[PDB]
Design a protein around this ligand. Sequence first.
Ligand SMILES: O=C(O)c1cc2[nH]c3c(c2cc1Cl)CCCC3
Ligand SMILES: [Ca+2]
Ligand SMILES: [Ca+2]
Ligand SMILES: [Ca+2]
Ligand SMILES: [Ca+2]
Ligand SMILES: [Ca+2]
Lengths: 365, 356
Amino acid sequence: MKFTVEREHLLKPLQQVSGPLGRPTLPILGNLLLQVADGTLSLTGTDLEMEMVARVALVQPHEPGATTVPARKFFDICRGLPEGAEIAVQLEGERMLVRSGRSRFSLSTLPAADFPNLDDWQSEVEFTLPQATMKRLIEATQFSMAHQDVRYYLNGMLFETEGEELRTVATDGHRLAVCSMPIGQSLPSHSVIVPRKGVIELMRMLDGGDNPLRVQIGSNNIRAHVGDFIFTSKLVDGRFPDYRRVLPKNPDKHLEAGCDLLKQAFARAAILSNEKFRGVRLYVSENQLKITANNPEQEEAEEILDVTYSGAEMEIGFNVSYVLDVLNALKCENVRMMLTDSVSSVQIEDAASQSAAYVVMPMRL
Amino acid sequence: MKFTVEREHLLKPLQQVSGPLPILGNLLLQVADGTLSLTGTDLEMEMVARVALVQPHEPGATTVPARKFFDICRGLPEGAEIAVQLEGERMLVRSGRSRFSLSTLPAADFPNLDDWQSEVEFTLPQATMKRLIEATQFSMAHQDVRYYLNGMLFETEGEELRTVATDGHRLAVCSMPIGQSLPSHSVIVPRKGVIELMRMLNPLRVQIGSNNIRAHVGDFIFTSKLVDGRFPDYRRVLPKNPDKHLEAGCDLLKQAFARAAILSNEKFRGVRLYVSENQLKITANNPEQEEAEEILDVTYSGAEMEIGFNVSYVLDVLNALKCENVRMMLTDSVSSVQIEDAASQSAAYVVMPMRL
Ligand SMILES: O=C(O)c1cc2[nH]c3c(c2cc1Cl)CCCC3
Ligand SMILES: [Ca+2]
Ligand SMILES: [Ca+2]
Ligand SMILES: [Ca+2]
Ligand SMILES: [Ca+2]
Ligand SMILES: [Ca+2]
């Protein structure tokens, strides 16, 4: 194996493939697979559940072959080299030698034959969509995912195809987020759970260019194709909850308010809320919302806002962190809070769009 | 106590006094004459800020949580007026239609530092004191049992102010002329107070006493206790005669160190240096049998030798230097090495050799 590549053509691909890799349990998991074949350098990083592949064209003389080298060490060397540095790489048995100017580097290798290989799988549904659409879908729901839960299925994100739309669903049991976006393609119905790190990697590969994203989904796998990068991940088997049964059936009390004004009022009030439970009180009356928070230290905050509201008065408690999470994810001018009573969930949406909806459970305080 | 003041005039002062026991997490607010005074402390050091009050005000003093009162004022929108009044066991904060009642502790209970006399006084530009601290800060010890090293020596001599810092493995010296005739004096400022003095940096007026150090800049006053101990003489740490002189490009030397370090030992990162005529070879290796080598064009001419260095110690020096050319003054394979900028003698750095 032999290749010479300019620093900047190797740098970003190296960062991408290293994504799925802190403390590797076994030595080979800390390594990247390098392959030179048909004038192309393929790089691969894995964690047994997912793979990130980068393909790099070779304009300089090269020789076929494959080896694995430490990801972090090889990335650090290339990054450390000066801009425009020519990086000559050759496999020499047990070591891979890296040369650039009068800089010399020798890396430990493990056989390419020993590198983990995710089994082949048959695609069942395929569609293309803009990178921006995928970014929107992930950023709207990502925060609602559970962290290291025993209910493994909640630690991921549901991906749903229905009609002309692609949909994401995330919930941690306490609060729910759901976002739908049209893609202009007739789709069958699949409901697959994408793991936590898979959601991160999907988000990582969107460089904000106009390169379309090609998505393939199977019974047990998902694949995402952006530019010269191919991401494959195994899916999480389980029974993910339906969002249609979590959405409030009867929201009779609709409140409309400025998103940023609601956000900054909640943020100021949060300062004096209970440090563990993060509870804020909401009193809603005609065209006005009052936000109050108190902690065991006997401290009190109060905020008063002009809103649009015609319904009956009610008092309701919320975990302020959940509300602030929703409002930061919406990033719009006007927000809509769909209420029922003090013991039922709220539905929070963008006032101008039904494409995203949020459900937060009420709180006793 | 009662005052109404613009948000703009509180933001900067609040940030400075929240720099440095339950009462230590609070800020002392005093209203006297036509001034609001804000004080934060950690028992060792103290930061006082003054802000003028033109709106109807009432004199008095209380204490309120530092992080909370700051987060409230900063959380409010720009152009907001902030009305504050003490009402029994609570301080009421009002702006627009935002209300805040914070828990209080009496002003009489707030820990004030003992009164002390100034023995040495001098004024110097902000940029000079920044320069003096920046050049030596990294060489301070962190949690060493030798408490006198957990800080920085401030020395006056002739017309110069000098900072010295050492962790026993590497030492840093920097001298700057301030244009004033000074008495010879040395004091040790605690590392926490050193970093605080750095953040507040229009001349700075400095007052040094037997057990305290004070700094006046703008409308802020920083007072800190001194570390009571005997600090090592830098004059005896500098090598007697480093006859071997290596001159290298600062950035090239930096990058060649950072790249080689990648393949050194993860626990104690060191590189080997082979010096010959107009060439420097930087090598490194690890328990995985991995090797790095960096060849550099330099200016030397002296005798060939091999010497190892801790990567972090050298990089720290080169990052402080921020210059074109670095001069490395060597003696032998087992002795300390002096590092300086090639064009200036203001700063000197001494690093122990490392065995690899
Ligand atoms: O390596 C050196 O030149 C060196 C020598 C030193 N001798 C002493 C210290 C010291 C530091 C260095 Cl860097 C600090 C504590 C007092 C005695
Ligand atoms: Ca080799
Ligand atoms: Ca003022
Ligand atoms: Ca000032
Ligand atoms: Ca030699
Ligand atoms: Ca050696």
